[PDB]
Amino acid sequence: NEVLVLRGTLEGHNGWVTSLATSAGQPNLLLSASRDKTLISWKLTGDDQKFGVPVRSFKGHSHIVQDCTLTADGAYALSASWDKTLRLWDVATGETYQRFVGHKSDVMSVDIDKKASMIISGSRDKTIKVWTIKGQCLATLLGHNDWVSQVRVVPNEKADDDSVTIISAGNDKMVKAWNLNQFQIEADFIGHNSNINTLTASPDGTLIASAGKDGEIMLWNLAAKKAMYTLSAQDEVFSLAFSPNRYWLAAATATGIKVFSLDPQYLVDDLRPEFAGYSKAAEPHAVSLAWSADGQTLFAGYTDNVIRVWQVMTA
Template sequence: SASRDKSVLTWDLKAASPDAHSYGQPKRALRGHSHYVQDVVISSDGQFALSGSWDGTLRLWDIATGLTTKSFVGHSKDVLSVAFSSDNRQIVSGSRDRTIKLWNTLGECKYTIDDQRHTEWVSCVRFSPNTQNPLIVSGGWDKMVKVWSLNNCKLRTNLVGHTGYVNTVTVSPDGSLCASGGKDGTAMLWDLSEGKHLYSLDAGNIINALCFSPNRYWLCAATDTSVRIWDLESKTVVAELNKNVADFF
């Protein structure tokens, strides 16, 4: 987890005892950023964490040792979002400087997407897991979702429809769909290959995060008050998790 205390925490998700309601115990603090840590992701092999901070840098951490293996310097303002490619060999970042940067794991910036860029902060960036059609998807405070070709880092599609800033984007496990959400409280579903809007789902509040289920046709949306889970085939809510989440378990 990332925090405004400038650290990243790794957690043990096992319950402290069989009847305990506490399911998270902090294991290790990763320290090194000099400002708020805005985002953190874990590599698919579970060995590394990648963080983005308001100090303008990214850091790659060895989870086993808690040490920074690389610091990524290049953004001129706060880093708001970071992501690993599916093979963990490439890294993408989005920033308040309105650029998207593509990096290797050595901390070298390989490309800065500046042409046809977002006109406001880049709040979220994600790789598509589809290696046959390599894409980056980004969302911004300009209300836009943009799809970029990873091969040449050129804009492929503008996905237009949100009426407020976009907080989050996510790509389905097969790379066919993208979902986006933010200020307007609407989760918008997009066909990535066609570049068109499919349908929208109402979350009832500002959407802070979205993710697809890895093994079901479900989409989860996190708001300030709850986590809402939709079945995308029926477009119905299958669960809503609120503050009484302990009762759910």
Template sequence: MANKNISFELKSTLNGHNGAVTALAIATTKADTLVSGSRDKTLMTWKIDTNSEAQPETILPTKSLHGHSHFISDLVLSNDGQFAISSSWDHTLRLWDLTKMESVRRFVGHEGDVMSVAFSADNTKILSSGRDKTIKLWNTLGKCVASVKTDSHSEWVSCVRFVPNAKGNKFVSAGWDNQVKTWTLDQSCKLESTITHHTGFINTVAFSPDGSIMATAGKDGNIAFWTLNNGTGLYEFLYDVAVNCQVYQIVFAENPEQYTLLAATELGVVAIKDKEIVGFMKTSSCMSICLSATKDIIFTGHVDNKIRMWKVGIASSVHA
């Protein structure tokens, strides 16, 4: 019997940050530009040729972007790769023009550290959440058009993500109250369901590319998988996979037939497929992860201030 396992080959190390690398993003239409965020309060941009087999051992940043006065917690890029939005413990969001390499807008309204930010697929809506226990909806001009507190989480709201293929009209939040909440968007944010499953705070939520599968993870060391019920429009529990350590961020490989999940954890990088761990790379504590447009290259951000570039492969092991 042959099992296909995921392997990781280190291609390059990206050096430049002076603090833990907490956020990574790469545009699917502009695959040569990687953007990172760190506890050194900066964003950095990097030129990466993911199609080249020959990679330099060390890559240096092309630009360092300054503006935030505290740790950067999350960042996301527009679909065309022209803009980035970052969230910070300085209670703000910032919109960055990656052509001019400057901050062009500051979003003010949170009364505590901002922990997460998300961009709708059409790049017209922005979500944020934070330690003030609120979820905020913004337009791209920096105006807060809705703020949710009554139906929000009872503890810090650590993650917000739009649901794929929902035309920007559905999103999910997760918090330190161990709950996941699903929402619909119209003129306001309407609570759709509350999911209680995890036994510890939740750090991260991810969706398969078609939105049919959701995964959630955090402190309890379990990654929970959920399936979309097309009848109710709600997510129903499928199964847990135990990784036995804190999970900081998860991302689905963009192949709807495989649903391979990659996880950044306190022990390293974990790959999960078909309810099983099929790959593990021990590293310094890994806080962030993203896929390149070529799908076989991933980037991971670590507490040792480094970003690592990995070639992901499939190796078959034969068992009698």
């Protein structure tokens, strides 16, 4: 039934959209990512023209943003980039509470646990490093031999003990899940055929996805740690997306979005629309995606310089 219809975008950046972020406490309060050294804050007013007011740039690094994770409260935006950081931005404002420095090779990430505290970040030095909500390390993990690509938060409804769990990534072709308090050892994902360039997580504590340079999307549990639904999607995803509470997958496969539908096992609905003056090898192929925090609004993002948000509505 669900005819998914393709609508007004929100265009704005000069470089190349490379993440994007579900606001995670004020789902308007969009908050978007970059390549050309900012973060254009887009409202969703919504009211039609502009779908819905590009109200704070935020400028820079010196170099290219690969991320922009919102807090558990959702008004404090956490940077990264190719000049070896963080720089915690204020969503409201233009400012740098705490330069977090220290890496060597080019952050690839950023994420924040359910209370806004013991943050993490991958790298190319081939680690990891915790930097609390101060430029300071708990510790500097080293179990991987590689470019560890991405790490995620998971959002726990066994109501949290308190010695918790997070995750990771990927040229050694593996994952590894680090107690976020005292980085202990828990399981990994063996097998794959090249680069793990992403992963994702459950919106309670028992779901995950990884993904593709091979084609296959190798799925989860964390609270079963057993390898799952093994799909086959040709090119790659660069750019994965849970609906929050539907059971819909969203990931941007080059080519679709393949909604795969992680219950039964079907292709509902592929969005490759809209398109004007190209030689293929121009599509202006994505690099970040999200599901309205409250879970409709897919904020579909693309290279080019035009975000193209595309919600699901009625038959």
